[PDB]
């Protein structure tokens, strides 16, 4: 039974490193379009005033 328990995570821990790696960027890489959000909302009011 302990053969299976050890073999459950024989391949997991090293494959979780790239998992832990990429998950960090994919979470904390949302700032570039956050600034684009600032200019996208800047565009809407620019359209809004001229439409007004």
């Amino acid at each position: 039974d302990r053969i299976d328990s050890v073999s459950q995570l024989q391949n997991v821990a090293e494959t979780t490193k790239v998992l832990f790696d990429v998950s960090k960027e994919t979470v904390e890489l949302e700032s570039e379009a956050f600034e684009l959000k600032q200019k996208v909302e800047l565009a809407h009011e620019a359209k809004a005033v001229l439409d007004s």
């Binding site: 302990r2 328990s5 821990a13 979780t16 960090k24």
Partner: protein
């Protein structure tokens, strides 16, 4: 708030689980155990070694030794009950 990391924390987790207590038990129970009936000491040589190999071994384990004991009394007819009380 961030990426949690409980995939790799068994280096200190493999001590408190119940199977680990059995794990450290039976592995010690295995290494020194004799492989294939080695060191059985089948050649018994102590005083009446011949008796140790015919009936005293236990393969027969029957009434022959008491039959031998009874015959010894029969052979002692003129030593205990005759010529004496």
């Amino acid at each position: 708030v961030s990426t949690l990391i409980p995939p790799k924390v068994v280096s200190s987790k493999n001590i408190g689980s119940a199977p680990n207590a059995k794990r450290i038990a039976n592995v010690v129970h295995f290494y020194k155990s004799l492989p294939q009936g080695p060191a059985p000491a089948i050649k018994a040589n102590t005083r009446l070694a011949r008796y140790k190999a015919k009936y005293f071994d236990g393969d027969n384990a029957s009434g022959k030794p008491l039959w031998h004991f009874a015959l010894g009394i029969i052979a002692f007819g003129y030593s205990m009950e005759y010529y004496f009380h």
